[PDB]
Amino acid sequence: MLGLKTSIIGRRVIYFQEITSTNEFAKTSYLEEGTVIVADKQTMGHGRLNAKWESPEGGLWLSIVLSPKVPQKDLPKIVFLGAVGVVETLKEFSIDGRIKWPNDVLVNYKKIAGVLVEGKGDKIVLGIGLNVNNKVPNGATSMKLELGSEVPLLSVFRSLITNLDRLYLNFLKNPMDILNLVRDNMILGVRVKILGDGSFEGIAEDIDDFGRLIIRLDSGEVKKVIYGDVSLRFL
Amino acid sequence: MLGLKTSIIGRRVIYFQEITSTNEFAKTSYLEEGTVIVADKQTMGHGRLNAKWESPEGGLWLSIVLSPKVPQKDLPKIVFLGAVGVVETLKEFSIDGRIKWPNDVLVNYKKIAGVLVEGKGDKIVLGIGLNVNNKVPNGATSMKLELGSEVPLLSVFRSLITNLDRLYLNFLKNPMDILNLVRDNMILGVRVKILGDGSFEGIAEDIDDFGRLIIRLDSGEVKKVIYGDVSLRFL
Numbered sequence: 486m487l488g489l490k491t492s493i494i495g496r497r498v499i500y501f502q503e504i505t506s507t508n509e510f511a512k513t514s515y516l517e518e519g520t521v522i523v524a525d526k527q528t529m530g531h532g533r534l535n536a537k538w539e540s541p542e543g544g545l546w547l548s549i550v551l552s553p554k555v556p557q558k559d560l561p562k563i564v565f566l567g568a569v570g571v572v573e574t575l576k577e578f579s580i581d582g583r584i585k586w587p588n589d590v591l592v593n594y595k596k597i598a599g600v601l602v603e604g605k606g607d608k609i610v611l612g613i614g615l616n617v618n619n620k621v622p623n624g625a626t627s628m629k630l631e632l633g634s635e636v637p638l639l640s641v642f643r644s645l646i647t648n649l650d651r652l653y654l655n656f657l658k659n660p661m662d663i664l665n666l667v668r669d670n671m672i673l674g675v676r677v678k679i680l681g682d683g684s685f686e687g688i689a690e691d692i693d694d695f696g697r698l699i700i701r702l703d704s705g706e707v708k709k710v711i712y713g714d715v716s717l718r719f720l
Numbered sequence: 721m722l723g724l725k726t727s728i729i730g731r732r733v734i735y736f737q738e739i740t741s742t743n744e745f746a747k748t749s750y751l752e753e754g755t756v757i758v759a760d761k762q763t764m765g766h767g768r769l770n771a772k773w774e775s776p777e778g779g780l781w782l783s784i785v786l787s788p789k790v791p792q793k794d795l796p797k798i799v800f801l802g803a804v805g806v807v808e809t810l811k812e813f814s815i816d817g818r819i820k821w822p823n824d825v826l827v828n829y830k831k832i833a834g835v836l837v838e839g840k841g842d843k844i845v846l847g848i849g850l851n852v853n854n855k856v857p858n859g860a861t862s863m864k865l866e867l868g869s870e871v872p873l874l875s876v877f878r879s880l881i882t883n884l885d886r887l888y889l890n891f892l893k894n895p896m897d898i899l900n901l902v903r904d905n906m907i908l909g910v911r912v913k914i915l916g917d918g919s920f921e922g923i924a925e926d927i928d929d930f931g932r933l934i935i936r937l938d939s940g941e942v943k944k945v946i947y948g949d950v951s952l953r954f955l
């Protein structure tokens with residue numbers, strides 16, 4: 486009854502009033518490619534690592550099942566499809582989102598959405614959490630707070646799924662296209678610090694052909710940061 | 721993202737752009753009580769004895785998984801929950817739906833919806849096919865045809881699910897209540913022909929405490945019809 490017109494993403498949608506985590510469900514359940522798992526609320530929503538993802542009523546919490554018949558090397562760009570999809574949807578709603586490498590979307594440096602890509606067996610689960618009308622953690626923002634009005638959650642869902650289906654279908658044919666879209670929509674030319682063992686600081690110059698963040702240290706040294714269990718701070 | 725506020729029916733919803741049959745998927749798959757299976761169109765939709773059910777885009781084709789906590793003698797009344805739910809939804813849209821015992825809903829004697837209940841142990845599948853904006857076969861009608869304007873399919877879905885959840889929860893508490901609602905919304909006082917092993921005609925007087933149709937033959941003989949493989953025809 487939703488009448489979705491997409492080719493792959495959205496062929497099937499499993500909606501939950503409440504769920505632990507859409508990503509967890511998508512990983513442990515057999516689902517055909519393109520299946521979207523979405524819930525009004527998550528009781529165990531999580532981000533990267535062991536970070537909790539606040540998922541109250543009013544937000545858009547979903548996961549998409551994929552298994553791209555593309556080179557192994559291109560897999561790490563799936564996260565970017567999610568981020569760019571969110572950016573495109575936000576633009577449709579008069580909001581300018583900027584990508585904070587590698588999986589966050591900020592609006593005036595306030596986090597409005599986060600992407601989490603995982604894999605079980607050989608299916609890839611693309612998780613996206615976007616704040617719409619829900620309450621958000623301190624420092625974060627939402628479509629409602631940015632527009633100062635209640636936004637129809639289903640309208641945002643339809644928009645995002647439409648953008649993702651297009652981005653994904655193109656990715657399957659031209660896997661390098663997403664990189665330039667990210668470059669034109671990400672925060673660059675600013676100083677950042679990479680936390681953890683062997684931490685260092687420098688200017689985030691760009692992302693390379695593999696999506697690695699290129700940082701220029703003050704000494705002139707150039708380091709390439711892979712995205713995974715990485716922690717980045719804007720200085 | 722749907723924000724359904726029902727207690728049982730609609731806890732989860734599995735949407736399909738296309739499916740063979742929501743009833744077949746529901747019967748076959750491992751699903752929890754309250755899960756709704758819905759599709760834009762069905763390629764192999766069916767009624768009783770595998771009769772063909774036209775399921776083009778524009779209509780509401782869904783099935784609900786139930787596991788009623790009521791005596792076995794009450795199970796046969798589940799079809800009425802579907803028929804009444806449809807009538808209540810139609811009334812919300814100012815359409816005069818009337819029940820044709822025991823699974824059809826008519827508007828000016830044209831079939832606008834059909835209900836099909838299938839069981840197998842602890843699982844009962846309640847299937848409902850309602851013509852909304854789709855083209856229909858001769859003998860049938862739709863919400864769009866009766867109102868003269870298209871109706872938002874999702875609005876019909878939300879209405880029906882809300883009504884069914886309420887009716888179902890009350891059915892668990894008071895299994896006899898549904899019978900009163902059927903009596904008040906069913907076509908009675910007219911002559912009908914019962915088709916099965918042979919056939920007979922008489923006035924459809926009412927339904928008894930088991931949901932059996934009570935027919936008064938011209939001779940004054942009273943017959944009680946059980947819903948198995950009997951078709952009712954209006955003269």
Ligand SMILES: Nc1ncnc2c1ncn2[C@@H]1O[C@H](COP(=O)(O)OC(=O)CCCC[C@@H]2SC[C@@H]3NC(=O)N[C@@H]32)[C@@H](O)[C@H]1O
Nearest residue numbers: 506508530531532533536538539547599601612613614625
């Ligand atoms: N609702 C929210 N809005 C903005 N920031 C939030 C937030 N909830 C938590 N945070 C902060 O963001 C951090 C998480 O950042 P990360 O970069 O690691 O991780 C992320 O940014 C990814 C989030 C992915 C969420 C979706 S919801 C659908 C699907 N199902 C799931 O269980 N997950 C995915 C936390 O440590 C918090 O400090």
Ligand SMILES: Nc1ncnc2c1ncn2[C@@H]1O[C@H](COP(=O)(O)OC(=O)CCCC[C@@H]2SC[C@@H]3NC(=O)N[C@@H]32)[C@@H](O)[C@H]1O
Nearest residue numbers: 741742743765766767768771773774782834847848849860
């Ligand atoms: N779209 C339509 N609208 C009105 N009448 C129709 C129709 N398509 C077929 N018919 C007529 O209705 C008769 C079927 O009557 P019955 O009393 O046996 O059977 C019914 O009236 C039950 C129909 C149940 C349909 C739903 S759709 C969701 C779920 N998935 C399924 O596969 N089925 C259920 C056919 O023999 C046709 O003459």
